[PDB]
Design a protein around this ligand. Structure first.
Ligand SMILES: OC[C@H]1O[C@@H](O[C@H]2[C@H](O)[C@H](O)[C@H](O[C@H]3[C@H](O)[C@H](O)[C@@H](O)O[C@@H]3CO)O[C@@H]2CO)[C@@H](O)[C@@H](O)[C@@H]1O
Ligand SMILES: [Cl-]
Ligand SMILES: [Cl-]
Length: 167
């Protein structure tokens, strides 16, 4: 059943199973798969460039990591400024680098703080215990529970989803 009042469900996405297997082979855990699953249908980067944001808010890669976090945590982007955000687009064509950056970012911030910045950027890092951040985290963990409960879900075409507001 759906997490705390939210609307949720599942459906089939052609080719998604093979893509899940590629993400796992690139080092993605079930948590990583859950984040990717929440962010795009096909675990890809065909969403609009930067997800229509610029600077520190721009999103890159299959997890929609933001440039603030990438430049703060990932060695690939060390020392870079907000205005250099176009450099994050390297993650759009390298799954291995995308996963490496995700892991570096999660380790840099710790996972609970990582969720806050992933959801809400600099504002989230400074106010990480909001209701909206908690709802995002709950959505990810609900998806993860579906993946964890049946290993077929790690390789099949099923996408689990939870409705969260776009911000
Ligand atoms: O620090 C720069 C800027 O960040 C602002 O927060 C944004 C983040 O940087 C991300 O862009 C974040 O995107 C996530 C949201 O969950 C989206 O709904 C989703 O589509 O993509 C990602 C991953 O889930 O969005 C926030 C909000 O726009 C904000 O903190 C701002 O004050 C700050 O200057
Ligand atoms: Cl991020
Ligand atoms: Cl807070």
């Amino acid at each position: 059943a759906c997490p705390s009042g939210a609307t949720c469900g599942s459906y089939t996405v052609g080719g998604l199973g093979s893509r899940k297997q590629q993400v796992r082979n690139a080092g993605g855990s079930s948590l990583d798969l859950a984040v990717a699953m929440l962010e795009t249908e096909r675990m890809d980067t065909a969403y609009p460039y930067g997800d229509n944001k610029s600077g520190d808010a721009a999103n890159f890669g299959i997890f929609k990591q933001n440039w603030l976090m990438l430049r703060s945590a990932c060695a690939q982007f060390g020392g870079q400024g907000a205005g250099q955000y176009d450099n994050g687009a390297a993650l759009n064509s390298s799954l291995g680098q995308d996963v490496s950056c995700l892991h570096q970012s999660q380790s840099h911030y710790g996972l609970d703080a990582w969720f806050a910045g992933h959801r809400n950027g600099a504002s989230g890092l400074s106010s990480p215990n909001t209701a909206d951040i908690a709802a995002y985290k709950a959505a990810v963990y609900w998806i993860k529970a579906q993946l964890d409960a049946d290993s077929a879900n790690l390789g099949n075409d099923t996408r689990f989803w939870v409705q969260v507001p776009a911000i």
